[PDB]
Design a protein around this nucleic acid. Structure first.
Lengths: 96, 63, 77, 48
RNA sequence: UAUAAUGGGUCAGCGACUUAUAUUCAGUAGCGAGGUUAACCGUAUAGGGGAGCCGUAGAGAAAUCGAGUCUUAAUAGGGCG
RNA sequence: GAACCCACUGUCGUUGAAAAGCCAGGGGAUGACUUGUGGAUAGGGGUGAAAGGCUAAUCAAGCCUGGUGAUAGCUGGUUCUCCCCGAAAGCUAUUUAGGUAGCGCCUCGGACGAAUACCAUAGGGGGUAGAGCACUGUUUCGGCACCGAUGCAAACUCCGAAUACCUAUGAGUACUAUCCGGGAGACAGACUGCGGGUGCUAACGUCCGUAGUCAAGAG
RNA sequence: AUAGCACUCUGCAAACACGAAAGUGGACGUAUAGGGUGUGAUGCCUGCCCGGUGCUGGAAGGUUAAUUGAUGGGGUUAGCGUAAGCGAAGCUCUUGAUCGAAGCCCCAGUAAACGGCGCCUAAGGUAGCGAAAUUCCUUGUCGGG
RNA sequence: GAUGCAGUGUACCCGCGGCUAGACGGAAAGACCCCGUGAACCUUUACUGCAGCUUGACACUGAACUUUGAUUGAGGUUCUAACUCUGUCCCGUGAUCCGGGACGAGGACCGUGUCUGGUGGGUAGUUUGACUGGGGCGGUCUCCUCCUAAAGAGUAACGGAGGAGUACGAAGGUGCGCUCAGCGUGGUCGGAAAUCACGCGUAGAGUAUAAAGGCAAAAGCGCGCUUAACUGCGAGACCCACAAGUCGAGCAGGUACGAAAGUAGGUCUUAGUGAUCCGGUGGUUCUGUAUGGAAGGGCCAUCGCUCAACGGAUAAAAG
């Protein structure tokens, strides 16, 4: 596969570009709706790992507006975007 | 066994929502004679062609 | 012996792309010409390689006009 | 043959253009006014 | 190709698209914004085991941001969503 | 010149008596002679009065086993039945030319719904057939480099069709047209008619465009 | 292949060959002997060229391998200063001053070394032979049979 | 190149002896020829490595005297203790090996290990292109223009005929301004042919370069000022298997020319060219492996050798 009769292949006649980032492999992305899986009102890296929404080897996580929530959630140690923070405050939770 | 990636093609292709993005060639060393519009337009990233997406998928089973 | 011939250049695909009576949008190319067989009329621009394109939305029309009899192509809004 | 030469901005921004010259017809260095995007102002570019 | 192109003297028996793993698509079945366990334990096709994988969000080389994001001086325009 | 050693000519034999012989002739025959028993030299090595000769009927690198089921764009073969649809021998690239990859052509599933085709009407560009000498070139006969008659041209044109191509509208007859995806095969073509190059206005010759048939189709 | 002839190497723990070494043959020999190379009884003989390659001797005028290590630039680190973004010891990254033989360059000899023998070169065939195992035209021409 | 097809001629059924005209008779997947990015062996001033030989530095490796160069370097003469003896004698010993002891001849040499320059067909792995009216020799391989090409595009042959691998800081931008060339008459050494006056017809001149398509708002020619030969883009279309290629109104920022509308993102256009990997230079609100840095990497701009067999087997290769 990838051999096209002798002429320079597509994957070799185009240039290499980019470098890999290590911190991206440890950063975690979390949906707002996924917080419903967390037992209790505390949102943290430990509680997320306990709920199995973040892998045990990640060091930091972020929450993005993707779905909806109904319970109040006090968020600690997790990065919150503008929409996610607005949704949490509307639901009645607090940050830090 | 487990399928193996073609690392050379992985280093040239990257994953998007509905396809693959690449850069453009003809911009490494010989550049003085090239015109300004050529220099600008060949800059940036474009999309992989449909006739080549199948080969790219075969070469990159996971990304 | 041998032959001193057997050289030719690749094709260039010249010609009239849009014919009279058709509808075009601004930017459409009308004539691909090595020289000015046709000259630019109202709402028609000339490129650096003598190409003719439409600078407005309308309908193409060919005419013969002028003292020299130059062939003109224009776009009616 | 015509040599390839680099014109550098006088402002010191590091910006440079490239061109070609014929030594016999232009033995000396070449200076010309051009636009410098780094400062958004026309300045004098001098041959390297 | 009747070819004067190849193969077969005849009969009986044997003789060629498989198996393991990974991945994509199709059909069908369970569950369903969720789905599913591996090694292993287990008087063992049961039951336990949630580490892990896939989906749920993109943009960017990256930092980073996020229903937006990259380029730019530009809340212009344009690319990808 | 016998024994012994050898192998120059010819006949027969060639599924032989014989996987190298017989018959009739022939050379050496005290020598660098012939021969018995035992021993030494082992494979990129041994030995060779040197022919690449010999090394167990095997030698431009012995034989046996193992790597081992070596690789083979090559040749060959591939086993029961019925129904539907149905190609190609082209372009581009190639350490390529009898291989392969993308596109073109086949089939199956999903979205889609005339946006498709034939014909009629309306609009549009051309530089071919033909013709011509106004440019370029070339040709003959005449009168003072010019002029009057006169002929020719793939790379000449003052001219110039029929066809073909593009767009829009419309009746009728036709499940057409486009997009996404699963699976391919194929990239050695042949003849005939029309327009041509090449050849000798030769070839069941060769190379192109265009249409029919064979290929894959009997009567 | 051969007797004969010539060139060249070897002073003995010889040259040379085999082997991984130990060692073995050469040889229980000692230049009149051993190894390699060419020619090939015998008679008459064996011409010219050292330009090219090789071999032999000398020169030491030029080049640099390891090694060596002068200097040059840079990273970090200390100490002053409201303020200048100043800036060292040590550690450490890199640079290559100089030293350095052979080979190569250069000079001379060597052809019974490999080789060459038409205005030009190293020089353009001495004897002897010649339609000759060498002659295309060629069944060249004359004599004999 | 027919026992088996068409037409036609001849021919009752079956042996034995003999013969070789045919059954493209039997025998051996043609050895001649061509192909496969097949094999083997041989050659060399094909490519690349190694054994062997050869040079030097360090180590094994010491001492006493001597002369000369910048505490230190290089030579020369001696000595014995490291070390050599396929030299004599003694013993193990009944022994041409070996080991130890005595003597003799040498001796810091020779020789061995590590590193390093040269030589190296002795040996080893390999390479030595394609097209082609069979192959070889010859010629060609990329780009541009005209014909073949059958009035849209495209279209082949070892078909016909020519060019390219550049040039230019003005030969670019802009304001203003001007038309060529050949002919007929008179004049200085100037006439076929020099500079200059007028007149008739007429684009037949020129446009850096080959040809075609063009050129009066001349795209041809001259002068003054200048650097738009710009930065960030870009609606829309042409061409195309891909990689690639081409035209472009308009928006924002600085600029030159012009009183102004306005023109200018190089040159009348179509050839003047090379992908990817590696490496160099300048900048970078990126990254930078415990932390602060740095090194290294990413990004923007740009540079270099080769790939002309010109989509470029590994920048190394013949018979």
């Amino acid at each position: 596969p990838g051999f096209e009769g002798g002429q320079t292949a597509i994957y070799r006649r185009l240039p290499k570009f980019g470098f890999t980032s290590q911190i991206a492999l440890k950063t975690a992305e979390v949906r707002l709706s996924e917080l419903s899986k967390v037992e209790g009102d505390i949102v943290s890296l430990e509680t997320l790992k306990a709920a199995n929404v973040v892998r045990r080897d990640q060091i930091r996580a972020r929450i993005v507006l993707s779905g909806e929530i109904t319970r109040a959630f006090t968020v600690q140690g997790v990065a919150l975007t503008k929409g996610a923070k607005a949704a949490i405050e509307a639901a009645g939770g607090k940050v830090e | 066994a487990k399928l193996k990636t073609r690392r050379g093609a992985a280093k040239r292709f990257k994953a998007t929502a509905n396809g693959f993005k690449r850069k453009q060639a003809f911009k490494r060393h010989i550049l003085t004679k090239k015109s300004a519009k050529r220099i600008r337009q060949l800059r940036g990233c474009v999309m992989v062609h449909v006739s080549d997406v199948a080969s790219v998928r075969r070469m990159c089973p996971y990304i | 012996g041998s032959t001193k011939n057997g050289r030719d250049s690749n094709p260039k695909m010249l010609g009239v792309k849009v014919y009279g009576g058709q509808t075009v949008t601004a930017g459409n190319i009308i004539v691909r010409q090595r020289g000015t067989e046709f000259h630019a009329g109202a709402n028609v621009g000339m490129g650096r390689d003598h190409t003719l394109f439409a600078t407005a939305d309308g309908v193409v029309k060919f005419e013969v006009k002028g003292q020299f009899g130059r062939r003109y192509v224009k776009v009616e809004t | 043959m015509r040599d390839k030469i680099r014109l550098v901005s006088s402002a010191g921004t590091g910006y440079f253009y490239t061109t070609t010259k014929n030594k016999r017809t232009m033995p000396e260095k070449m200076e010309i006014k051009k636009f410098d995007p780094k400062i958004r102002q026309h300045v004098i570019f001098k041959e390297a």
